Design a protein around this ligand. Structure first.
Ligand SMILES: O=C(O)CNC(=O)c1nc(Cl)c2ccccc2c1O
Ligand SMILES: O=C(O)CNC(=O)c1nc(Cl)c2ccccc2c1O
Ligand SMILES: [Mn+2]
Lengths: 388, 388
């Protein structure tokens, strides 16, 4: 009961060509009839569950203006809140609530790894986070109540911030466009577009967020390259001449260091595996949860061909890569699974849009090595087995 | 007390040309009349200190064959050891005992960053660590007693080890050369030469060890690069097309990822800083230590003119690089200190083999910029101030 995409009457090819990472776009009634599958009471319910990232922001009513209280929480923390001018933000709700993750099937024109999470916000009247920017694309989805969004179509290069407030707040903000959003309305913002939303009543917002790695993150992820190396090439200086100045890291020495790192980076087989892992790795505290009990290959096959379904639990943490051999590597929550060329074409399937069923899986379902793979993915918590 | 180099009759030019990282060399009486500056009980005392890396290896007479016991120890651990066939090994003794670090100024024809540490080992009769190979250059300095070294001139491409011992022991070892070393004798081995050293009496050996980073290590030190990025360039796909298969990490995407990483390696000044910091960073758990009291620039200047000398506490952790604009960066125990072009020539001096006196520092002492630098270097325990 959800449309093929979140773009209304706009085709993805046209949207990507004229708006993606360029300029904001206001889709009216992207999701006709869409109401939040989760309620404010349930959201506050998730905010208490351990391993969850949650923030409470009060523009006023706290000890000081713009106070930020962090999770985890206790049930008592919420009842003693002012009637208005606060807001609750919970991250990776798509990981916790399958019904929310369903929404993620409307943004499959973007590749999986560019997907991050769906954070859900609740806010009584007047609740806000304040005028701010983000370094990532976002689909702002109204799921309850109404929100007044003010934005500036001009992206900001330098972030002029308010001092000492422990929340990224824009000192000077000049809106050129104001909008009132009802449930089903969708506001797309490219990176660095300043936006200021305010709740006109008890409302909820679903923020579909994307991710783009900067150099700093990629550098921090590089120690994982060591996993596939087995040491690798070693610095060698057999043609060493006596050091004029022993403390000098010579230009010839820096040359060889550059060479060693390049050979590392320029190996595409090696680089693909590294990136596939570090980009699907869980970013916060919610890894995949293994099932209750073990499951035999024959039982899976049986249960599967009786109409059972396989569900993807974390699409943003699901990706793959093809190699020159015809082989492929599958990526699920930071881990790599090697696929022979015989199996290489299940990767597009398991990570793609298509429903996982007996009909859909018929081609490989009688191969032993393919059932072992499903068994592994089910036991890891990557795929959930769903009865009919 | 010590010669200019550890090569005796040989010239640094010849050695590096004909032996360094190629052929083993036995230099007899390379250090004439050199006995160890510390005793086995002094060494046992070091092995008891917090943060030190020490090993106790019993070939026999232990709980089982080739038992290894790891420090830090306590004095009790040395009382009930067997009469024979065991060894104590302590790492980074040069950073603990100044008189041992004095040995390091016989190897200054090799650059500083290529130096690792001096490992001191004690053994009664028969004591050894077994036949093994090492991935690094080493000068094996006999500091007390007699030791019988057996080696083999052909390096090992693939090391076949004895299974499950917690010590890396060669299964097959056939020596084609043998010597018995007396105090002052020095044996140089290039990387991956199988050697087997057995003590013929109470023994002390000083292993001057070098370091050469492989690709695995460089990948591991990469996160430090994030210090200078302030974020860096971010991945961007404005001209993205609708994904035929959303789970695929496309070559176009991997190309941009490859570009973002190569930007870090190909910017030479920025790489020079990263490498300087990660190669002078302390390898293990021995933090450089401060002085008992703080010294003003005036005081520092005063004591220097009154005959005080500056001592380099850790030479292997001292280096510098010159930049294109005449500026330089001084590296010390993993920290980078920027030097203006006018001040860029103190770096050879501070890291070099010259003594650090009022005479040698005469041009620089008048500068406030230089004293300020010396203050922090003393403060952090890179340089120790000593009276005449
Ligand atoms: O040579 C002998 O059998 C007796 N010598 C020693 O026991 C002895 N051994 C060592 Cl390792 C040292 C080591 C340093 C200083 C003196 C030593 C010493 O008298
Ligand atoms: O104490 C005894 O009766 C026997 N002890 C030793 O023989 C012995 N004792 C000590 Cl404290 C050391 C201490 C350091 C190195 C060797 C030692 C050694 O062989
Ligand atoms: Mn935002």
């Amino acid at each position: 009961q959800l449309p093929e995409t979140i773009l209304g009457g706009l085709a993805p090819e046209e949207f990507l060509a004229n708006y993606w990472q360029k300029r904001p776009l206001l889709i009216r009634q992207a999701l006709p009839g869409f109401r939040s599958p989760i309620t404010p009471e349930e959201l506050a319910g998730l905010a208490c569950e351990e391993g969850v990232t949650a923030r409470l922001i009060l523009e006023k009513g706290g000890a000081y203006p713009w106070e930020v209280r962090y999770g985890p929480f206790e049930p008592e923390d919420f009842v003693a809140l002012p009637p208005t001018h606060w807001t609750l933000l919970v991250q990776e709700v798509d990981r916790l609530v399958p019904e929310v993750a369903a929404l993620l099937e409307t943004v499959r024109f973007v590749p999986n790894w560019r997907l991050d999470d769906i954070m859900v916000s609740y806010a009584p009247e007047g609740g806000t986070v304040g005028a701010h920017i983000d370094n990532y694309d976002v689909f702002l989805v109204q799921a309850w109540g109404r929100r007044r969004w003010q934005i500036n179509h001009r992206p900001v290069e330098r972030e002029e911030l308010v001092p000492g407030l422990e929340v990224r707040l824009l000192a000077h903000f000049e809106p050129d466009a104001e909008w009132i959003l009802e449930p089903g309305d969708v506001l797309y913002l490219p990176p660095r577009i300043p936006h200021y939303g305010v709740a006109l009543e008890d409302c909820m917002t679903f923020s579909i967020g994307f991710r783009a790695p900067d150099q700093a993150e990629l550098a921090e992820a590089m120690p994982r390259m060591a996993a596939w190396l087995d040491g690798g090439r070693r610095y060698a200086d057999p043609d060493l001449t006596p050091a004029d100045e022993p403390g000098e890291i010579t230009p010839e020495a820096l040359d060889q260091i550059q060479a060693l790192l390049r050979a590392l980076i320029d190996d595409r087989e090696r680089l693909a595996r590294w990136f596939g892992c570090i980009i699907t790795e869980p970013r916060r505290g919610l890894p995949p949860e293994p099932p209750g009990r073990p499951l035999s290959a024959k039982q899976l096959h049986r249960r599967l061909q009786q109409g059972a379904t396989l569900r993807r639990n974390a699409i943003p943490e699901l990706a793959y890569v093809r190699h020159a051999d015809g082989s492929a590597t599958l990526f699920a929550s930071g881990e790599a699974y090697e696929l022979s060329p015989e199996l290489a074409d299940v990767a597009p399937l398991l990570t793609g849009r298509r429903p996982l069923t007996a009909e859909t899986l018929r081609p490989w379902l009688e191969r032993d090595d393919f059932l072992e793979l499903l068994q592994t993915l089910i036991h890891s918590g990557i795929l959930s087995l769903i009865p009919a």
